[PDB]
Each structure stands twice: as structure tokens, then as C-alpha cells.
Write a protein that binds this ligand. Structure first.
Ligand SMILES: Cc1cc2nc3c(=O)[nH]c(=O)nc-3n(C[C@H](O)[C@H](O)[C@H](O)COP(=O)(O)O)c2cc1C
Ligand SMILES: Cc1cc2nc3c(=O)[nH]c(=O)nc-3n(C[C@H](O)[C@H](O)[C@H](O)COP(=O)(O)O)c2cc1C
Ligand SMILES: COC(=O)c1ccc(CCCCc2c(C(=O)O)[nH]c(=O)[nH]c2=O)cc1
Ligand SMILES: COC(=O)c1ccc(CCCCc2c(C(=O)O)[nH]c(=O)[nH]c2=O)cc1
Ligand SMILES: C[As](C)(=O)[O-]
Ligand SMILES: C[As](C)(=O)[O-]
Lengths: 313, 313
């Protein structure tokens, strides 16, 4: 049994990939992800200029998950574009580039430059609809009229199929609104649910201290903490966006967790915290575990159960 | 060494109490909570009329926490008012009464009738704002205009100090806006952070099914999943509402978890999922555990560390 699959006019050996920001910032990291058994990779979200990001410590992990306030450290867009255009071996697996400009204009400028590389090489865009704190203003995907604007301007500037990285929502009216926004854009062909659960706070009892330096310890949560949140977002968007793909991200440590994401609707399954903690060897384990659950159940393909979570009545 | 607190013109033996909805629906439940070692109790959120709530199964628990869509089952306001007015033994501990009307008028009608019993008997109101208003709109506390309306109307109708049960927020701009709304209302004397993390989805891998019946499996999350979210919300409101008390709720299973809440700013500490799972014996364990951490650290009272979480630099 193999798990190869066909999305966005690309072929994938399996549905696994890193989550943006994990093992993907440097050329070393991208080559390591390309050498792994993952089905695809995605670059660190980028800005027009290089950034050092926030002061350390800015990531910590724990048995139930991680917290981070990285601050968008990256090598800058020119580097990731060069990686895409000149360095990546597309014979090995597909590449996604994540962009997270600090304004709409910065994102439009990056997308106009990516477009011909996308056409020439097939690199795929993941637009990160997360943002820095601006007092008096929520992140873009939490401001639905702002989100509609970004997406209008990117669609126009880019002109090619792309995807969007979403934060979690917690309210069914918000699912309805967000998905309606996304469905106004036919070039949005995948939706990645979810980014980290925003602005949690981990405290060390012995030291009586927060554990990350930025933002008085507040940071985004990943890992075990967030799996039901992630599943809920995957399935909410799966149900609301039938003409799009949904990529699942959040809380995947095992092939069973990936199974759950696929049952909820996921096409690709992205691995953040667990990959950060275990390293790239995780991909062979995930694939073996997923194939074992499939075999036990009699499933021969991912399509047999994608989106097929059962409700009661 | 001492767990006593004196706040809101009451004396509490210790900071622990049930979270609303857990072990508090029936007279039997309320008598059980009263007979426990908890420092206080709160009643099930009520409506004007009795409700059967949602179809079962509607609550499930797992190693990392719980999911529920109970649908507000309760015996109705008159019952809880009678319990406050005639049945509760206030010499044992303080009582809070939670109200969760399905419109602002229903809340007004309840608090006008509660007011005299509050004044005579000293029952304390906790107004649930994580609660539907118009379907297709967000819950009340995710709609800042609705929230302001609810608070203006309840403040006028009730005329006495009360508190509010808040959902978690995930964006700094929402912390800022929410707290600013609360700080418009001087009668809001305590803020309970947090209600369950909304619209999670737990899926059973073996059965391939969601585990609760209502809402196609979507429900609010409690327990280990939500502790860093809870701590963040306690701390954020602690910092932003210096003239109010913050009560902590979410992910408390141990004295250590409680100590973390208290470091974050909690006065009272509410126990939901863990109490549902363990039963009321949990309160003696929590008290002993908290006192053991205080002894190791040399703390003699709760005020010596409440709000004293350290940040880096
Ligand atoms: C250290 C770190 C850095 C991240 N950087 C980014 C980023 O650059 N872009 C992004 O879209 N998400 C970023 N994320 C979010 C992850 O892609 C992912 O959405 C989140 O961690 C949840 O998945 P998990 O439970 O597997 O960790 C980052 C996460 C971590 C832990
Ligand atoms: C079965 C159940 C019923 C609940 N009912 C209510 C309620 O009536 N009113 C309310 O404010 N919160 C209610 N909640 C939320 C809890 O009060 C609490 O905010 C949440 O469970 C998080 O705390 P925990 O992590 O200790 O479970 C309920 C939670 C559970 C599990
Ligand atoms: C808080 O300090 C800041 O300057 C700052 C904080 C956050 C940002 C935006 C981060 C977007 C990239 C990202 C990161 C990250 O780089 O911090 N972490 C995540 O969990 N998800 C993400 O999408 C930009 C600046
Ligand atoms: C989902 O179907 C319904 O009919 C319905 C669902 C929910 C409500 C509001 C519930 C408020 C009480 C409450 C409950 C609850 O009783 O379901 N559960 C929580 O975790 N926190 C709460 O604050 C009212 C009706
Ligand atoms: C593996 As690294 C510090 O470039 O994310
Ligand atoms: C997946 As079967 C063949 O057990 O319904």
C-alpha cells in the first residue's frame, strides 16, 4: 500500500508536510525537509526584508505542546524566492512558499514577484493571514472586511491558485462569515486550518515565571493542547468550502492524529510542534502508523475516508 | 499558613469552588457542593423557564479534558432563587448564582428579582456572557456592542455588585476591547476567566465518529487542553482591570495548577472538568497540594503571590 496523492496539479507521495515556521527557515532547513520522507514542504513565512525576530527565549515545548512568539524571523523574500527559483529539487517533492507581509502592499509586492516563478517552477503560495499586534486592531483573519480586502488585492496581483493559512475560530457565526469570505475568491484553492491558538500563557511553577521573553510570556499554542480546536476548524471549513481543499494542521503527533484530521476533511496534514520536537524522522513514523490504521480498517485510499467523520443521528 | 480570602464583603475558607454547570444543577448537587471542602459554590446557569437541554450524549471526558454541548439544561430561575433565598446555609460558605438568559430582557427580568435576595442574604451574581443572543451572530461576549448593552441593562436593573463569566479571547486587540467594555461598569466587581474554549471537535478514531450528539459534535472544551489559554485570559484581565477581581477557571486539576492561576492574578479558582471527573473529594486534595507548594516556597497567604507572575527582563 502506498499513499501517494494529486492536488493542485501536483503529485504527492503522501499527505505529510512540515507546518510553516518549523524546520524551514534556512537553506539547510529546506534541504533537510526535502531529504525527509515528507510528501511536501513549506518555507518559513517571509517578509520583504530579513528579520531577526524577537528576543530569546521565544519558543518552548512541554509534554502537551508548545508556545512561541518567534516574531517572524526569516531570511527575507529574496532568499525564499531564490530557493524556489534556483535551489529546490522539484523532482523530490512539491514546495509551498509562505508569505506574511506586514501590510497589504508588502504582500502584493511579494506575490507579483512570485507569480512567474509559480508559473515556471510550480511553487505554491500559502498566504499567512496572521499579523503583528497593532493596538486598536485585530489580526487580519479576525477582521473580516480587512481579510476580504487582502484577498481581493492578492488575487488581483497574483492571478494564480493559492492557499491561505487561517487562525482558529471558536464561534459558529465566525465559521460562517470566514468561509463566506473565502468562497468569494475562486483563486483560493486550499485553506490551511490552523495556525497556533493565539496568546496563551505558560507559567513555570518553580520559578514563578513565564517561559518566553516576548509579550510578557504570551504566545501561540501548538501541539496536544490544540488538536480538538484544529479538527473543528478543518471540518467547519471542509463543510463550508466544498470547492476548495482543506489542509489540516494542529496537534499531529501520530498516524492516528493524522487519520482524525483526514476524517475531518484534510487533504494534506501539516506537522509543527511534533516535528520541532522529534525531528524529520517523524515522517516515516507517521506514514507507517497511518498505513497501519488504514490496513486494520480495510481502507486502501485516503479518499475512502476523507471528510467521512460520522455524526450521531 | 493560610488559604483564607475576604472579598466582595464575604469570607472564604479557601479559593476553591465549582465552575458553573458542574455539580450544581439540582438541590442534591448544591447540598453536595455545600457539604464539600470548597470555599464557595456557584449554581448552574439558569434561564427563566426550566430547560431539558440538548440530546445525549452531550458531555464526554478524556485524559486531556472534556467536550460539552449541554444546551443549558436547568431547573429554572425560580428554583435557584428559592435555593438562595430559603435553602442555602450561608454559615457554611458563600453562594454564587449564575444566570444565562437568552436575551437581554430575560436577564433583566431575573436580576430584578434576584436583587432583593442578594441584598438580604448576600448571594452573589455571576452573569454568563458566553451565551447566544441572535442566532447567526456571535455569542454575546464576542459581540462587544451586545456585551455593552447587556451590561448597561443588567447594571441598571440589578443595582448591586456582580461579576461576569467570560469566554476566552485569543487576540490582544480583543483583550483590550473587552476589558475596556468591562471597565465602563463599576458594578462589575469580578471577572471569571474562562468559559470553555468554544466549538472544539473530538473524534473517536476507532468508531470514526464525533463523541457528542448536538451540533454535529462541536462543543466547548475544558480541562488540560485549556490551561494556558485560561492563564492568559486571567493575566490579561488582571492587568487591564485593576479595580476588579479576577476569578480563574480552566484546566485546574492540582494545587499546582491553582497556584499558577493565582500567580496570574486569580482570587477565586473554579474547578470544572476535574471536579466532574473526580468528584467533590477533589477539594481536599487541591487544598493540601496548594498548601504544600506554599510551604516549600515560604508563602503564608495567597496575597503574597497573587498576580506576582514574573516576566523575562
Ligand atoms: C516555532 C514556530 C514557528 C512558526 N512559524 C510560523 C510561520 O512562520 N508561519 C505560519 O503560518 N505558522 C507558523 N507557526 C504555526 C504552525 O505552522 C502551526 O500552525 C502551529 O504550530 C500548529 O500546529 P502544531 O500543533 O503541529 O504545532 C509556527 C509554529 C511554531 C511552533
Ligand atoms: C458539563 C459542563 C457544563 C457547564 N455549564 C456551564 C454553565 O452552566 N455556565 C457557565 O458559565 N459555564 C459552564 N461550563 C463551563 C465551565 O464553568 C468552565 O468555564 C469550563 O468547563 C472550563 O473549566 P475546566 O477546564 O475546569 O472544565 C460548563 C462546563 C461543563 C463541562
Ligand atoms: C510579538 O512580536 C512581534 O514583533 C511580532 C509577532 C508576530 C508577528 C507575526 C508572526 C507570523 C508568523 C508566525 C509565528 C511567528 O513567527 O512568531 N508564529 C506562529 O505560531 N504563527 C505564525 O504565523 C510579527 C511580529
Ligand atoms: C447547542 O444547542 C442549544 O440549544 C444551546 C446551546 C448552548 C446554550 C448556551 C449555554 C450556556 C451554558 C453553558 C454550557 C451549556 O449549558 O451547554 N456549557 C458550557 O461549556 N458553558 C456554558 O456557559 C444555549 C442553547
Ligand atoms: C531548525 As531552525 C533554528 O532554522 O528553525
Ligand atoms: C472500512 As469497513 C470495510 O470496516 O466499513
Amino acid at each position: 500500500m502506498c499513499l501517494k496523492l494529486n492536488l493542485l496539479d501536483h503529485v504527492f507521495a503522501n499527505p505529510f508536510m512540515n507546518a510553516a515556521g518549523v524546520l524551514c527557515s534556512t537553506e539547510e532547513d529546506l534541504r533537510c525537509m526535502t531529504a525527509s520522507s515528507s510528501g511536501a514542504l513549506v518555507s518559513k513565512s517571509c517578509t520583504s526584508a530579513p528579520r531577526d525576530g524577537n528576543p530569546e527565549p521565544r519558543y518552548m515545548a512541554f509534554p502537551l505542546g508548545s508556545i512561541n512568539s518567534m516574531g517572524l524571523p526569516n531570511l527575507g523574500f529574496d532568499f525564499y524566492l531564490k530557493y524556489a527559483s534556483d535551489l529546490h529539487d522539484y523532482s523530490k517533492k512539491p514546495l509551498f512558499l509562505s508569505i506574511s507581509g506586514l501590510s497589504v502592499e508588502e504582500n502584493v509586492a511579494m506575490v507579483r514577484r512570485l507569480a512567474p516563478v509559480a508559473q515556471e517552477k510550480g511553487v505554491l503560495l500559502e498566504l499567512n493571514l496572521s499579523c503583528p499586534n497593532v493596538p486598536g486592531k485585530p489580526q487580519v483573519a479576525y477582521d473580516f472586511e480587512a481579510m476580504r480586502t487582502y484577498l481581493q488585492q492578492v488575487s488581483l496581483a497574483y492571478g494564480l491558485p493559492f492557499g491561505v493559512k487561517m487562525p482558529p475560530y471558536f464561534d459558529i457565526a465566525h465559521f460562517d462569515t470566514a468561509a463566506a469570505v473565502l468562497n468569494e475568491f475562486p483563486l483560493v484553492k486550499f485553506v490551511t486550518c490552523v495556525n497556533s491558538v493565539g496568546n496563551g500563557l505558560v507559567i513555570d511553577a518553580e520559578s514563578e515565571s513565564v517561559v518566553i521573553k516576548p509579550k510578557q510570556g504570551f504566545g501561540g499554542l501548538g501541539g496536544k493542547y490544540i488538536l480538538p480546536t484544529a479538527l473543528a476548524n478543518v471540518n467547519a471549513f471542509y463543510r463550508r468550502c466544498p470547492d476548495k481543499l482543506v489542509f489540516g494542521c494542529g496537534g499531529v503527533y501520530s498516524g492516528e492524529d493524522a487519520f482524525l484530521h483526514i476524517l475531518a476533511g484534510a487533504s494534506m496534514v501539516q506537522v509543527g510542534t511534533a516535528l520541532q520536537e522529534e525531528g524529520p524522522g517523524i515522517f516515516t513514523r507517521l506514514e507507517d502508523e497511518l498505513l497501519e490504521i488504514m490496513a486494520r480498517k480495510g481502507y486502501r485510499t485516503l479518499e475512502e475516508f476523507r471528510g467521512r467523520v460520522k455524526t450521531i443521528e
